[PDB]
Nucleic acid binder design. Structure first.
Lengths: 101, 98, 49, 86, 48, 115, 50
DNA sequence: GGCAGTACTAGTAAAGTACTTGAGCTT
RNA sequence: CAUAAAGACCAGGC
DNA sequence: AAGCTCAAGTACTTAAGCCTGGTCATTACTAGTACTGCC
């Protein structure tokens, strides 16, 4: 699933440019490597490269849900700031459950 | 106790090693031809200047890409409320314990 | 002596100069009042601060 | 920090070994001057901290290190160029 | 003898912790061991 | 920002009566005066003057709150004597005292200088 | 104080009263005595609220 | 006039609990 | 009637 | 040999309530394209 723009609103800066939520960029990665995997399924490649792309795709798909997993490198969007996973959105104090409800 | 000297030294060493590191990178990559070598194009001052200025500016103390591992709390903005508050803020200790 | 009626105050009150400090905290900056103002973008809830 | 430690960090760093010709780099000594601003035109001017606050400048000094460079061409002559105020 | 009291003991009770910081067992004596300190001393030796 | 201007103390704006009069049903022959825009300066005078009158059973004043400028004076008199008459008589007596005090104070001034 | 002094003064018994005022060592011991109170005040609140 | 090099601009990395797990001892 | 983002750390208040 | 329970070993967790200010940086590297200079 891809959540609506309401769940992941953009960031309007001065009207010059629109920044984007952690999701939008994460889904961007998922679509990039998903498309690469589609193409390399049409070609067939060397077939271990497929395994590599399914492991990295595993990293993105499983990372968007949980960025706090131990034993795995935690995805870094930019600026040395880790992503906010849906779990991180719904979990701690100021998360939707305890914070907004 | 870590004052300006030991702190700014610990900060200056690694940055200086990044300076030497990019002198090695640009150096060797410019050497592989065997043409010649030029120093003034191999040194980036943004390293030392922007690094010192940064880690003094934000207060996060260490490499900025490592800022997670880097200690924070050093170099707060000085309090101008009262001359007593300033004399107090200039003379202070901070325990690293959480 | 009492201020209002001028009668003596029976007990003898302790008077002297002492040095007092006004503090940065002042009510004019701590007062806030809220009726249906700006709203947070993501939560559709009132703003913070 | 300035009068001791910085010379220790510059000196105690290993000489740069590189390479067939060889390229070696060594840092002789380090020199500071009073805080100075290099403007948009490149004109240096001494900064008093007042104008440093008012303009949001950074009050800082330029840092110069002599750099001796040795090249080994295998011809028995290794040519060293020394550069002042790098 | 001391006993944990207040907030920490309340944590031990509410948490139903496996090992409390100060476990204690009070013991009463039926017979002449109760009033006389001698037989009481005997039970003191037998419980320790 | 919420500070009232320097006058809530005396100046009356539109509609406020200086004196308002309300009868008191708790007791027969007792009345209650409300003086807008005054404080203990006047009320202490009037109360202390009403306690001399032998026909006045009760005389009292209060400010219900200092940040508001108001006075409440309860007066209870003996039968067949209106408390309003006691309050008028009180004021008239007060003037009769203050004028005399002015004149004697002027005589004292003129005596202390070359006298 | 001299090593191995268990006397009332060395171990923090305060003879003076706030009116007469403390001696310096009794003042420092007194500050130690108050620090525990401040620390208890700060620490207990979180556990109590939780 | 064509080719090469350099620079600039735009993509892009304490304690305490439960839970599990491995070993150790028996029908 | 709309725009000033979000986040981060730090200082402080009860 | 199967299976049984019981021991240590290991991973993983949450840590007060509300409120007020400020500073700060949103990235720095690599690749590609365009422009200028030299042959």
């Amino acid at each position: 699933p891809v959540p609506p723009l309401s769940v992941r609103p953009a960031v309007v800066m001065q009207g010059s440019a629109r920044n984007q939520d952690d999701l939008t960029h994460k889904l961007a990665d998922i679509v990039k490597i998903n498309n690469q995997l589609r193409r390399n399924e049409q070609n067939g490649a060397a077939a271990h490269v497929i395994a590599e792309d399914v492991k990295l795709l595993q990293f993105h798909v499983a990372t968007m849900v949980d960025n706090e997993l131990p034993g795995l490198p935690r995805a870094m969007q930019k600026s040395g700031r880790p992503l906010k996973s849906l779990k991180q959105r719904l979990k701690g104090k100021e998360g939707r459950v305890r914070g907004n409800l | 106790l870590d004052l300006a000297g030991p702190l700014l030294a610990f900060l200056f060493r690694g940055m200086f090693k990044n300076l030497l590191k990019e002198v090695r990178i640009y150096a060797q990559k410019f050497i592989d031809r065997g043409k010649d070598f030029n120093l003034e194009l191999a040194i980036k001052t943004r390293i030392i200047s922007d690094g010192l200025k940064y880690s003094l500016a934000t207060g996060n103390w260490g490499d900025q890409k490592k800022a997670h591992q880097a200690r924070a709390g050093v170099s707060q903005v000085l309090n101008r409320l009262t001359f007593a508050s300033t004399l107090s803020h200039l003379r202070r200790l901070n325990s690293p314990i959480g | 002596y009492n201020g209002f009626t001028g009668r003596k105050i029976t007990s003898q009150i302790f008077i002297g100069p002492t040095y007092y400090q006004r503090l940065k905290h002042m009510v004019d900056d701590k007062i806030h009042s809220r009726a249906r103002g700006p709203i947070q973008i993501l939560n559709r809830q009132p703003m913070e601060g | 920090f300035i009068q001791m430690s910085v010379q220790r960090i510059v000196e105690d760093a290993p000489p740069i070994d590189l390479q067939p010709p060889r390229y070696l780099l060594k840092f002789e000594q380090i020199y500071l001057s009073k805080p100075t601003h290099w403007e948009r035109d490149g004109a240096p001017s001494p900064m008093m901290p007042n104008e440093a606050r008012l303009r949001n400048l950074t009050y800082s000094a330029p840092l110069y290190v002599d750099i001796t460079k040795t090249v080994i061409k295998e011809g028995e002559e290794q040519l060293q160029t020394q550069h002042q105020k790098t | 003898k001391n006993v944990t009291l207040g907030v920490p003991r309340l944590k031990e009770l509410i948490n139903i912790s496996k090992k409390p910081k100060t476990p204690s067992l009070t013991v009463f004596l039926l017979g002449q061991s109760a009033r006389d300190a001698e037989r009481a001393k005997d039970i003191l030796c037998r419980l320790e | 920002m919420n500070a009232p201007p320097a006058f809530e103390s005396f100046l009356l704006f539109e509609g406020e009566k200086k004196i308002t009069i309300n009868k008191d049903t708790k007791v027969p022959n007792a009345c209650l005066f409300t003086i807008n825009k005054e404080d203990h300066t006047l009320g202490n005078i009037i109360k202390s003057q009403l306690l001399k009158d032998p026909q006045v059973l009760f005389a009292g004043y209060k400010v219900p709150h200092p940040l508001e400028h108001k006075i409440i004076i309860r007066v209870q008199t003996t039968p067949d004597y209106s408390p309003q008459e006691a309050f008028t008589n009180a004021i008239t007596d007060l003037i009769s005292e203050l004028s005399l005090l002015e004149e004697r104070f002027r005589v004292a001034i003129k005596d202390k200088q070359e006298g | 104080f001299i090593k191995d002094d268990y006397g009332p003064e060395s171990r923090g018994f305060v003879e003076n009263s706030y009116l007469a005022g403390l001696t310096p060592t009794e003042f420092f011991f007194h500050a130690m005595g108050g620090r525990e109170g401040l620390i208890d005040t700060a620490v207990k609140t979180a556990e109590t609220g939780y």
